[PDB]
Design a protein around this nucleic acid. Structure first.
Lengths: 108, 100, 111, 104
DNA sequence: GACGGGCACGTGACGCG
DNA sequence: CGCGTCACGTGCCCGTC
DNA sequence: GACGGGCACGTGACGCGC
DNA sequence: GCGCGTCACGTGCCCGTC
């Protein structure tokens, strides 16, 4: 009667534990912490719960540095122009300093 | 009594359920799919199993292109830093040709 | 008379060119940039002048994170004390809710 | 006639001197401490040749440890973010119990 | 003695082609 | 009539106190 | 024809120590 | 009381693109 219902629980409880061990086998943290708390069913959950939080953290780094990728490469064109306008004037003026400082020493 | 041991298990069961519920609240697969088996506790695990293992596979496809994308901001600082090195030399040179 | 001083200068220029190729061999950009201006003597200067700027940018970035790795103890005590303070209160108050939410069904039924 | 080619050589020799002086002004081995023998232009090259050779092995030592040191800020982001989730849940739970007309 | 906390197992309840 | 959710109890083999 | 630019090579000039 | 050793400057020439 309900003794057949005991077997359906045994199936479905076994499903959950075997889902944790598959979960356990794929988190790197559970495969290096030889402890009786990490190896617990309750540990794998809060470990994967964290693992996802950190996997979504790296993923949300990747996305965020793409919305700005067009703008900063646009900035690259700008500051790549600013170096040359400054360097040419830097070279122009260093020629205009180092060749006129010399015209004042022996001016007469 | 054993009434402390019922509370201990109830605490342990509450931590567990709050750790699939937090798990439930974050996987987009079971987010607002309202399934009778998908929203079950055993399903979130298969959904988290299929979300961790998919995010791992994703972020390695990303790191192929991301490391090259990362350098573009390193350069943005670099070439930004060059500007002041030459802006100081330019301003140094700009305030020395005055008396000639 | 000065043909011995042509020897003195040729020695010096050879030193400088071979101090460029020694430089040229140790900058990774010139090691793979088959360019007429990159392979120029003057190119190796502005390539090494950049290559140094970027290594300075890394070490001066690399160390500046150690002045703040001091604050691994900061987020320890932000993790050690704070997260359990709220989790225990979270689990406590969530149990205080759902013990009286069972009496809500007790008081008012649906028919 | 050739006066433009003299000016062109003058510009080219200016760029490389500006490139050794830009080089000289950053290598600490000759950062306004070194003599007339080491501020020699051929000497700055051997010192930049050292500085680069010496920084690559230094850079490679740091990132052996820095990689583990970096993730402390990653976790600082992580653990600072966990606080927000629990604060929202704790704020959610603290006000749903003020409608239960009994706190503790 | 004091309790905790681990994991597996039964039940009743409830919603189901 | 069996499924299948679920939380809740229950020993027990065991920890640390 | 027009200019630029590459690199090697030769000089006077200058600072030097002996 | 001159051997070195700095350095920039010119110059051919072997050669690019406009």
């Amino acid at each position: 009667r309900r003794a057949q219902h005991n077997e359906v629980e045994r199936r479905r409880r076994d499903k959950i534990n075997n889902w944790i061990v598959q979960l356990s086998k794929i988190i790197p943290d559970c495969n290096a912490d030889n402890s009786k708390t990490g190896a617990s069913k309750g540990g794998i959950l809060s470990k994967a719960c964290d693992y996802i939080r950190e996997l979504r953290q790296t993923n949300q780094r990747m996305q965020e540095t793409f919305k700005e990728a067009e703008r900063l490469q646009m900035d690259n064109e700008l500051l790549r122009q600013q170096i040359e306008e400054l360097k040419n004037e830097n070279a122009l003026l260093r020629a205009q300093l180092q060749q006129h400082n010399l015209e004042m020493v022996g001016e007469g």
